[PDB]
Amino acid sequence: LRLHLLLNTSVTCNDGSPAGYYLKESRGSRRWLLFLEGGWYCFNRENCDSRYDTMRRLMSSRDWPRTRTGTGILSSQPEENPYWWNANMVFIPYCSSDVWSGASSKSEKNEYAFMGALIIQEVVRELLGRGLSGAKVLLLAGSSAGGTGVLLNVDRVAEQLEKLGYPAIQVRGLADSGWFLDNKQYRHPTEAIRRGIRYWNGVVPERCRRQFQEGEEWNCFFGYKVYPTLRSPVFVVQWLFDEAQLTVDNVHVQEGLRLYIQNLGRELRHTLKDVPASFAPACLSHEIIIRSHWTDVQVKGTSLPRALHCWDRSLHPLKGCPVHLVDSCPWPHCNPSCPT
Numbered sequence: 346l347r348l349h350l351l352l353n354t355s356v357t358c359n360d361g362s363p364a365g366y367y368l369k370e371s372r373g374s375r376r377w378l379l380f381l382e383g384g385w386y387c388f389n390r391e392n393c394d395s396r397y398d399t400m401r402r403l404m405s406s407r408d409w410p411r412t413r414t415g416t417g418i419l420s421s422q423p424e425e426n427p428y429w430w431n432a433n434m435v436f437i438p439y440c441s442s443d444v445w446s447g448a449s450s451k452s453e454k455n456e457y458a459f460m461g462a463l464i465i466q467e468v469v470r471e472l473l474g475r476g477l478s479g480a481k482v483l484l485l486a487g488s489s490a491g492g493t494g495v496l497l498n499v500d501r502v503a504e505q506l507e508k509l510g511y512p513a514i515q516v517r518g519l520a521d522s523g524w525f526l527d528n529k530q531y532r533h534p535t536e537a538i539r540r541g542i543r544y545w546n547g548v549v550p551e552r553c554r555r556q557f558q559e560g561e562e563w564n565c566f567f568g569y570k571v572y573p574t575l576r577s578p579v580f581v582v583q584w585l586f587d588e589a590q591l592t593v594d595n596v597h598v599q600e601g602l603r604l605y606i607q608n609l610g611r612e613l614r615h616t617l618k619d620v621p622a623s624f625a626p627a628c629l630s631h632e633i634i635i636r637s638h639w640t641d642v643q644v645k646g647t648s649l650p651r652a653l654h655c656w657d658r659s660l661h662p663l664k665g666c667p668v669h670l671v672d673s674c675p676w677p678h679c680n681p682s683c684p685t
């Protein structure tokens with residue numbers, strides 16, 4: 346995939362350098378995959394300054410390479426990507442440190458720009474001149490902070506395309522490893538997101554904003570609270586024992602911790618009971634869709650590329666082609682196909 350820096354240079358990474366996207370076109374295809382990278386976030390001046398010292402590619406385009414290799418769902422090889430190998434592929438780097446929510450420029454009062462929500466909008470607008478105008482399906486995908494970003498942005502992309510005069514493009518979401526619980530820690534998270542939203546001028550989807558109201562928009566960063574408010578179809582991929590969830594919960598085995606871990610898996614499974622398109626294996630891991638070996642994991646005998654194909658068919662239950670796949674066994678690696 347080849348790098349393109351945004352033509353509108355007022356849409357910027359944290360340090361004011363232009364944001365951008367990596368593209369590989371497939372001219373025999375009307376499917377478009379736009380993938381949002383992850384990588385945590387920063388929520389005040391001092392924490393963002395630290396990230397600028399040792400995580401600068403997540404804050405700036407000045408050092409980005411001219412190309413990236415497409416892997417997993419972004420691969421063009423059928424053996425690596427049984428699902429969408431012939432699609433047009435787009436990788437959008439995460440350089441806004443705001444869970445893709447921000448709408449604030451650098452200024453005499455702001456050391457950093459937080460423009461994640463505007464970066465997505467501007468990528469979409471510039472791609473319409475490069476072939477996206479002819480699309481039949483636009484899949485907005487993402488991992489980790491990018492998976493939460495899908496939940497925060499998929500309906501805004503759908504509204505953008507309607508208002509621009511493209512009502513026939515079907516917008517859908519794929520959220521990988523971005524479905525978190527605001528639960529009690531094992532030893533003594535929502536404070537940082539509440540502060541972050543104020544620091545970023547962060548924006549959340551309109552229906553969810555109207556439910557929770559002023560001061561409470563942080564709620565919309567949690568999948569089980571924002572998902573019911575969304576109109577676009579969204580497929581949710583989430584490990585039952587996500588490593589980022591456990592890190593924030595201060596988990597690094599006696600009875601108290603055994604019960605804590607079993608209760609976490611049960612709660613996650615409960616939040617997915619009424620999510621009809623979902624894939625949730627009983628593994629300790631983090632991210633999957635752009636890993637080269639994403640084809641290996643299975644739930645109830647069905648792989649993730651197969652489940653996504655069954656989802657495509659359902660949007661035209663299906664015999665032998667399931668779309669809701671959630672493990673019921675209660676401990677990490679009770680599924681034999683978990684990543685080693």
Ligand SMILES: *[C@@H]1O[C@H](CO)[C@@H](O)[C@H](O)[C@H]1NC(C)=O
Pocket residue numbers: 353355356463
């Ligand atoms: C460039 O982006 C900024 C910020 O979103 C916007 O206000 C401005 O209208 C854009 N310019 C053009 C020509 O689209």
Ligand SMILES: O=C(NO)OCc1ccccc1
Pocket residue numbers: 383384385386444489490493522523525538566567589
């Ligand atoms: O990036 C991560 N972890 O992978 O956190 C993003 C985030 C923070 C708070 C609430 C939802 C999502």
Ligand SMILES: O=C(NO)OCc1ccccc1
Pocket residue numbers: 525526527528529530534535589590591593594
């Ligand atoms: O609120 C909590 N639990 O204490 O975590 C929420 C969370 C978990 C994982 C990643 C981001 C945000």
